[PDB]
Symmetry: C3
Subunit: 114 residues, 3 copies
């Protein structure tokens, strides 16, 4: 799984160790081994929600399975709560797009997962 | 809806007003209240298009519905035109990828839209 | 096609001309004309892979066709190898997501590729 967070929160407001926390929490939440979890946090972005520059985040979770209606509700409660708390973003200014990737469409280590 | 623009045009070339203007135009094009519209502009990128470093942009519009070939022509005429003019980019060096998201695959406010 | 590379390798570690090289390599591998290929490299990123901040990359290739199980294996061998060598990244710390785009879902020049 790959989790990306783009945010207008500045880098100094991003806790050191957020990427480790996300890695461990995503391992637990998805049941996928930590070895396969990648995280990418992009602070200082020029972004708006509702046309305003108040703190916001646009995120994505890509995974080969472990994605779907009920699971994504759970993920959204976990990850909106964690980002809202850690980055001080209102949860109604966070989107998370979920992507169920086919194993044939993910390259890694010079091959694909198919 | 979520609109993302990645460009090699510098930050000083991005009008302060542009994210508000994009919000207004996307609200007209989609009918959605600003509350649901997110815009993300990423200037100063290392990019090429046709193997050249001339000004370009790579963009995405994610929307729950309201996506398809006919409708995307309307979005493309609107958004290519506006970005070309505001960012001083030739319209033939702008791509916009459209993504029709399932409501179950968009997290917001601690839940999903499903 | 569009190829994006996000990496924690610093900008100084990106060899000059890598985006030209990627353009050429993608052109030959996909059979798409270079004129339609865009490349975006995003260095200095805050990233982890397996919970470690060692060099890694997360990439995407979007293309109208030329995507599929066998093709993607060929692209992955080529692009993992090239990025590993150029950016000094272990191949087991690179993901590449592939996306087969409908022509109707790619806007370009004020229209779409389905209409061009």
């Amino acid at each position: 799984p790959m989790f990306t967070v783009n945010t207008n929160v500045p880098r100094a407001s991003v806790p050191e160790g957020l990427l480790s926390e996300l890695t461990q929490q995503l391992a637990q939440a998805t049941g996928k081994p930590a070895q396969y979890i990648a995280v990418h946090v992009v602070p200082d972005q020029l972004m708006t929600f509702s046309g305003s520059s108040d703190p916001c985040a646009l995120c994505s979770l890509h995974s080969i399975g472990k994605i779907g209606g009920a699971q994504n509700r759970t993920y959204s409660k976990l990850l909106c709560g964690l980002l809202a708390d850690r980055l001080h973003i209102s949860p109604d200014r966070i989107y998370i797009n979920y992507y169920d990737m086919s194993a044939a469409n993910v390259g890694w280590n010079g091959s694909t997962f198919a």
